């Protein structure tokens, strides 16, 4: 379905150069990803560790299918930014069902809705995003060494093109260029990792290597040293892409350089797909019996990375004044928690790893939505700060600084509370969902003897809570540097809106001002749902937590 | 018994070898042409501190073990304590030596008492279901076990506290305990 | 043995390069070449056509990477005006 | 004590030094691709060193403390 959707969308895209089509090509892509959800939902009625598909090259697991569907929902939610206009005009005279379904509202919307904005004029943008999803989902399903390499490339190359699709931005071309170059270094490590596996073992099957590994677990000419340190090189190439330290340096720069609607999808999807792929590898390569092979486990990179990602993520985030550089360092400290749960391989830690990855991906997406919405709200607001005048590419990243958020609770209080709840959920404060995620990973690590990493993580969090609180301190504790626009609210300049009925006949003409201009519903509803999921998780935790209890039971059974 | 002087050089060669490449990386990122032999010109001090901190961690860690002949978590604390104290001496400041001896001293006590998972953790080799079941339903314990733990007295006055207390006082102070009859009759 | 030697040239020609980004993008092409060579030489030793098949697919994606690279490099040059990498 | 050492060996001291420690690690973020590749290759080297040498984990902890606390030292 995703492949039919790419080919069909590409044929329609290839016979048009009309930039007005970008909004409708994005709306059709959301319809396409909804069919993919209906198909992977139908495929969920089997209990199995894995079923080889297509000549052994691909596999399907309950974990593989629940993760494709999650990627599809997340993609539908990110695709909304390019599918609907940011702003809106709302009047009580146009607010009933008969009004919405049988009346029309005519007015000059070109400036109010930013019809000709850059996010609304890239025809191929949904198409390149579908290719990244195609690569992401194929990687979760990869069962061969060759399949892994092609799938990570199909995911990576599209992220390079998305990072560069704003071609008139010197900031995106630079972010795109850094990411392509250093990710190409990352892939050369991944190719070396796979190449050493096939060269020492004669097989491209992951299923064959897991069998060789399980026999070699006993308790003289061909000791299987290659598996642990071929997998080590293979692993470093994936720690670059999830931006786990000490391979993290690119992500603050790239995420800060590319536009914010783009940094939303590029900073979230690669992690879900890569972490799920590594989970099956870590389970099937663990030597239950202590052995010489155990002393050299490739998974110690993951602990070293999780250790480093905790210190690096929270400390370097202390003196970040740029909101996108802050969001990326917050991610490097959260991937440390993810890595720690991935390195302790146990039922409790696999439940914790699965819960943490889904909740952080919805929470980091809320953070991006609030950020994007806050910088679309500043349309009827004006500032006189020299710093806010000296910024670069203000159209692609409307909010670039933490200080730009100073006094936002006095401009829009509920959106500021929504960002407070999301940030407090990154801290790990109860009874929010992020606390429960952090507690589940601490409980698993404490049970399995990783007492030292648990102590690092708790001390690390208080350090990271410092810069999270400086964000909230900026929202709540000072006064706005932004002022209502004096001419958009002047009581002398008002545009005319006119309400017609089902057949091109006028009903009522209205005169409207800037106070009649609001955020479009698709973004306020999306922020509202994720905020309330985060807020009220304690009353709605049973089905979500049980979904992860069962997947772990299937993976560790038999 | 371990050769601390022989060990520490091996400990110095390992850690000091790492600072060699961090020195080489510093030379490469230099913006001015100094030449290949600059590795020991300015960068020599960086590898020397890596060399100094490493073996100073090992000799003292080893020398502590030879002092009493027992292997446990604490020995790594002393060696770590010294390795940090060595870090400050490069800067030349008493607070740094103490602030550093405290930090890397406590780090290498914690990871050695807790078994940092960077080389795995202890294998269960037993029924995990049983171990949790046993620790949860051993709700009553023999009175001897608590007495060995908390002692006796301070409110832990078991049956037989008074009979033994009289004997214990006699063997120490040489006084026979006999409370007064405290009654005109009987 | 030429496999390691070639792989080390492309790794340092990528990391130690202080000239320009086309030479950056060239050095990736060298590393992939050395890995393909290791895979091609092993496959002849193990009578495996799969290794040659794997090699051919690393050539096709290595050309896809170099086209995406040259395309991104042009975009960057149009705006920056130099693809020279600057030290000091 | 109170408006003194208690604060210095505590919140104010951790505040002052942690701010400096993080400015220094931010200093490595020069956004130049060749420097970043060298950082990636160095971490690639050190993970190989840690693994196949079968180093005791204490060296790694000490190396990190030593790096963090030479990153604390300026210049």
């Amino acid at each position: 379905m995703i492949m039919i959707s790419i080919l069909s969308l590409l044929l329609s895209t290839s016979v048009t150069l009309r930039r007005d089509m970008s909004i409708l090509f994005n709306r059709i892509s959301i319809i396409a990803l909804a069919y993919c959800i209906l198909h992977d939902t139908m495929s969920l009625s089997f209990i199995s560790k894995g079923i080889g598909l297509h000549g052994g090259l691909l596999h399907i697991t309950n974990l593989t299918q629940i993760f494709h569907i999650f990627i599809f929902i997340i993609s539908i939610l990110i695709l909304q930014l390019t599918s609907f206009y940011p702003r809106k005009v709302w009047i009580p005279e146009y607010s009933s069902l008969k009004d919405i379904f049988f009346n029309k509202i005519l007015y000059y919307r070109t400036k109010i809705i930013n019809k000709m904005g850059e996010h609304m004029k890239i025809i191929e943008y949904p198409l390149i995003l579908l290719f990244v999803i195609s690569g992401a989902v194929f990687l979760i399903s990869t069962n061969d060494l060759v399949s892994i390499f092609l799938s990570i490339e199909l995911q990576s190359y599209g992220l390079y093109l998305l990072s560069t699709i704003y071609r008139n931005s010197e900031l995106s071309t630079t972010g795109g260029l850094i990411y392509f170059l250093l990710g190409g270094l990352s892939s050369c490590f991944i190719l070396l990792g796979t190449s050493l596996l096939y060269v020492n073992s004669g097989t491209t099957s992951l299923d064959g290597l897991y069998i060789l590994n399980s026999i070699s677990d006993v308790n003289s000419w061909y000791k299987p040293y290659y598996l642990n340190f071929s997998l080590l090189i293979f692993s470093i190439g994936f720690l670059f892409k999830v931006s786990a330290a000490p391979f993290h340096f690119w992500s603050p720069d790239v995420y800060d350089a590319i536009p914010t609607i783009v940094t939303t999808f590029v900073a979230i999807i690669a992690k879900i797909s890569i972490f799920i792929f590594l989970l099956e590898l870590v389970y099937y390569t663990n030597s239950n019996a202590n052995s010489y092979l155990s002393e050299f486990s490739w998974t110690y990179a993951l602990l070293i990375s999780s250790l480093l990602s905790l210190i690096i993520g929270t400390v370097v985030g202390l003196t970040q004044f740029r909101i996108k550089r802050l969001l990326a360092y917050s991610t490097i400290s959260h991937v440390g928690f993810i890595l720690l749960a991935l390195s302790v391989s146990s039922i409790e830690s696999t439940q914790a790893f699965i819960f943490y990855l889904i909740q952080y991906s919805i929470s980091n997406l809320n953070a991006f939505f609030i950020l994007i919405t806050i910088g679309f709200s500043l349309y009827g607001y004006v500032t006189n700060n020299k710093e806010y005048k000296s910024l670069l590419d203000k159209n692609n990243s409307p909010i670039q600084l933490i200080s730009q958020l100073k006094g936002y609770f006095y401009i829009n209080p509920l959106l500021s509370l929504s960002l407070a709840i999301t940030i407090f959920s990154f801290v790990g404060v109860p009874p929010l969902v992020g606390f429960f995620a952090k507690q589940m990973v601490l409980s698993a690590a404490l049970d399995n003897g990783y007492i030292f990493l648990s102590l690092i993580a708790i001390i690390t969090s208080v350090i990271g809570a410092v810069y999270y609180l400086n964000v909230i301190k900026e929202i709540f504790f000072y006064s706005p540097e932004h002022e209502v626009n004096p001419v958009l609210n002047e009581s002398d300049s008002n545009f005319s809106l006119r309400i017609l009925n089902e057949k091109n006949v006028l009903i009522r003409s209205v005169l409207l001002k800037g106070r009649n201009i609001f955020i479009s519903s698709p973004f306020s509803i999306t922020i509202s749902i994720i905020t309330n999921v985060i807020l009220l998780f304690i009353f709605m935790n049973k089905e979500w937590l049980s979904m992860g209890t069962i997947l772990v039971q299937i993976l560790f059974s038999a | 018994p371990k050769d601390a002087v022989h060990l520490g050089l091996k400990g110095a060669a390992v850690v000091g070898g790492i600072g060699l490449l961090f020195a080489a990386v510093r030379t490469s990122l230099a913006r001015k042409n100094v030449g290949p032999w600059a590795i020991f010109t300015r960068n020599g001090k960086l590898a020397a501190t890596f060399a100094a901190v490493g073996g100073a961690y090992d000799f003292t860690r080893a020398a502590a073990a030879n002092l009493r002949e027992k292997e446990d978590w604490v020995n790594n604390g002393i060696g770590g304590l010294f390795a940090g104290a060595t870090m400050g001496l490069t800067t030349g400041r008493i607070p740094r030596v103490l602030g550093f001896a405290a930090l890397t001293g406590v780090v290498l006590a914690t990871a050695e008492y807790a078994g940092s998972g960077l080389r795995g953790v202890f294998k269960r080799d037993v029924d995990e279901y049983e171990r949790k079941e046993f620790l949860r339903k051993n709700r009553r314990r023999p009175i001897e076990e608590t007495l060995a733990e908390i002692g006796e007295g301070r409110g832990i006055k078991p049956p037989g506290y008074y009979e033994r207390r009289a004997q214990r006082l006699k063997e120490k102070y040489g006084v026979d305990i006999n409370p007064v009859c405290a009654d005109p009759d009987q | 043995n030429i496999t390691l030697i070639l792989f080390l040239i492309g790794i340092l020609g990528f990391v130690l390069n202080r000239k320009n980004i086309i030479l950056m993008l060239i050095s990736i092409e060298i590393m992939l070449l050395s890995i393909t060579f290791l895979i091609l030489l092993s496959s002849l030793n193990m009578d495996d056509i799969i290794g040659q098949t794997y090699a051919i697919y690393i050539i096709v994606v290595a050309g896809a990477e170099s086209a995406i690279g040259l395309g991104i490099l042009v975009a960057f040059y149009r705006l920056r005006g130099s693809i020279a990498i600057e030290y000091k | 004590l109170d408006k003194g050492s208690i604060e210095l060996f505590g919140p104010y001291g951790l505040e002052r030094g942690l701010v400096k420690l993080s400015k220094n690690i931010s200093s490595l973020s020069t956004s130049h691709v060749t420097t970043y590749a060298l950082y990636i290759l160095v971490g690639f080297i050190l993970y190989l060193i840690y693994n196949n040498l079968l180093l005791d984990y204490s060296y790694l902890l000490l190396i990190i403390i030593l790096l963090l606390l030479l990153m604390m030292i300026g210049e």
Partner: peptide, 26 residues
């Protein structure tokens, strides 16, 4: 960097290739 990688990856490569790096094999 040259020696450390080369030493590490010399063991990763297999007997099939490391052959032919006074009693030779035929």
């Amino acid at each position: 960097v040259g020696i450390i990688i080369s030493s590490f990856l010399f063991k990763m490569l297999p007997y099939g290739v490391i052959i032919s790096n006074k009693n030779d094999l035929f």
